[PDB]
Design a protein around this nucleic acid. Sequence first.
RNA 1: AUGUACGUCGCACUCAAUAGUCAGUUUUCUGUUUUUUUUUUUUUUUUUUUUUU
Length: 110
Amino acid sequence: ILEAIRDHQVVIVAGETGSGKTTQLPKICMELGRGIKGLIGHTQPRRLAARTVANRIAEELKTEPGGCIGYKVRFSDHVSDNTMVKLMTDGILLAEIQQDRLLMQYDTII
RNA sequence: AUGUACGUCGCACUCAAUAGUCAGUUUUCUGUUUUUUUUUUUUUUUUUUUUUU
C-alpha cells in the first residue's frame, strides 16, 4: 500500500474488523514524504471514532495528542503548528470547504 | 023554503187442512299470562440512527 500511493493519485484500501488500516494509514503517509508540506487529513464518521484513534497514533508514535498528531472536531482545535496528522470528521472538512475551497491546508486526505 | 057526503101493517147473513229427494273413504295440528324500567355522559399512552469553520 506504500507503493500504490506513489504511483496512483487515488488509492482505495478495504479492511476487515481486525485490519488496523485506521491506525497505520497515516503512518504510511509520513513514511512516503507527506505530512510536512501539507496536513494529513483523516475523515471519520464519528467524533469519538475520530478522537479515540487520534490519541492512538500519538501513543503508537510516542507523542501526545494536540501536537504532531492532533484532532480537529467541533471547536476542539487541538492543532499546533508542528502538526502533520489532522484527524477530523466528514462535517469538519465540509465546514472547511467555505474557508478553503482548494483544500490547500492538506497534502493527503484519508 | 026543502033534501044532501068519511078509510088497516111486513125482510136477512156467508167461507177448514192435498208428493217426490239414496249416499258422502281414513287421520290431523291450532291455545295462553308472566317479570313489566324500553337506559342512565366521556377522554388524552410512546422511543433506527448519526456527523457540522
